[PDB]
């Protein structure tokens, strides 16, 4: 593997996700595959669909083999069903050889391929636990780690706020400056991490830290927004409104039903505290208004939404950071992304250490 060749291997179509070019089958068919740290299947369009240009035609691959079963995956908003097979895959921007992987080829879906989207498959980079139909369906990354002799680590940078980089097998030094801070992976399914505190404009929300983890707090490149459990969401909104020097935001702005338009110093920074590998210490990842008041008269949408379930550190936040998914050492690293700059200003910050003496030893419900 060549990590420098992986720099800028992702394309991003402006608020629609980051995708990697992958070559599948013999002879190779080129697909555009969404990078998704919140799921664990490699799935691609297998039939024509209104909102995709191309799909993987298994009949044109001499090396494709069918496993003889299907899989149906259901999400909150949508679903797909596909045949499960095996075929050879290459990642031209990073690797010089092919690898034998499991592949789901989608033949029906509901609200999955949306209009104006540039990808035609998904690359789930989470753990075996989440794989469907079961954890015995070897994940793409597990196949790659073995077959490509890379470390069990990958890292991701998103540069859309200012494309991006998926570095499979390690950390590319040219993608960050300053320090990488690591937080433990609490549970290996999603990339579940422990949130200790949220601070808006330097003021803590005064919630029990369990409110941040109640369902789970995860890092998910396949989630668009920063998604917060309703009670946490409500507290954030109240704090941003109190701290913001403009007269008022509509209720519709906060729920995403209305845009705010103008023809930055008046909006607060938002910090998320994460436990260090040493439990007495934390670090904070901070986003500036430019990352959560998102351009769409220049008009803006709120980059935070309520969750009925998890606290999801999605693209809203990942646009600010180089994120290291260090599976080998059961930790997630953060460093501020040099590319996360707008109008000459960094739009994210990282700092530490801070004491955790004021919070419980376990903020995950137990």
């Amino acid at each position, epitope marked *: 593997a060549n990590f420098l060749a992986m720099v800028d291997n992702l394309q991003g179509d402006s608020g629609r996700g980051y995708y990697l070019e992958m070559l599948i089958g013999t002879p190779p068919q080129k697909l555009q595959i969404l990078v998704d740290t919140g799921s664990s299947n490699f799935a691609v369009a297998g039939t024509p669909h209104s909102y995709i240009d191309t799909y993987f035609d298994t009949e044109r691959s001499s*090396t494709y*083999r069918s*496993k*003889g*079963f299907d899989v149906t995956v259901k999400y909150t908003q949508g679903s797909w069903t596909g045949f499960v097979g*095996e075929d*050879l895959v290459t990642i031209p921007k990073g690797f010089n050889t*092919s*690898f*034998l*992987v*499991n592949i789901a080829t989608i033949f029906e879906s509901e609200n999955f391929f949306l209009p104006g989207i540039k990808w035609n498959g998904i690359l789930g980079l989470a*753990y*075996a636990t989440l*794989a469907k139909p079961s*954890s*015995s*369906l*070897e*994940t793409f990354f*597990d*196949s790659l780690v*073995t*077959q*490509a*002799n890379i470390p069990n680590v990958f890292s991701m940078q998103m540069c859309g706020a200012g494309g991006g980089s998926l570095v499979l097998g390690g950390i590319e030094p040219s993608l960050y400056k300053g320090d990488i801070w690591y937080t433990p992976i609490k549970e290996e399914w999603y990339y579940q991490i422990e949130i200790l505190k949220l601070e808006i404009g330097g003021q803590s929300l005064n919630l029990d830290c369990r409110e941040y983890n109640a369902d789970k707090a995860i890092v998910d490149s396949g989630t668009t927004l920063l998604r917060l459990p309703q009670k946490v969401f409500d507290a954030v909104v109240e704090a941003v409104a109190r701290a913001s020097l403009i007269p008022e935001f509509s209720d519709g702005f906060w729920t995403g039903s209305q845009l705010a338009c103008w023809t930055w110093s008046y909006f607060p920074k938002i910090s998320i505290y994460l436990r260090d590998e040493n439990s007495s210490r934390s670090f904070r990842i901070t986003i500036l208004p430019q990352l959560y008041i998102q351009p769409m008269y220049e008009c803006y949408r709120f980059g935070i939404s309520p969750s009925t379930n998890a606290l999801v550190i999605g693209a809203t936040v990942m646009e600010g950071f180089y994120v290291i998914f260090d599976r080998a050492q059961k930790r997630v690293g953060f460093a501020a992304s040099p590319c996360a700059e707008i109008a000459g200003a960094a739009v994210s910050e990282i700092s530490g250490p801070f004491s955790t003496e004021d919070v419980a030893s376990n903020c995950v419900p137990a």
Partner: nanobody
Amino acid sequence: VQLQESGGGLVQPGGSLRLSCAASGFTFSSAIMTWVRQAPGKGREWVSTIGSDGSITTYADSVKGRFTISRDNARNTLYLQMNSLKPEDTAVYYCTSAGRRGPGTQVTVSS
């Protein structure tokens, strides 16, 4: 899931072994299977992979033409026939599938 390798040994250069791996606790007939090797002080090295029906096989350049991967789905067994063995093939050889591995079998090639 359980993987247990066997068939390693101590051989001369130019020698041969037939490694086996017994599998249980999952549907072996649907699993991609892979052999890896690891010698002390050296990097982990992929050896060969075989698709679930056995028809698709891939090999590391370091073993091409000397080792052959195969499987018997009815017997839940993966194999590695190793011919023309060299000192540099000395390693623990292990089987891996879906992020699990067996404990491995030692192959030592010495004059």
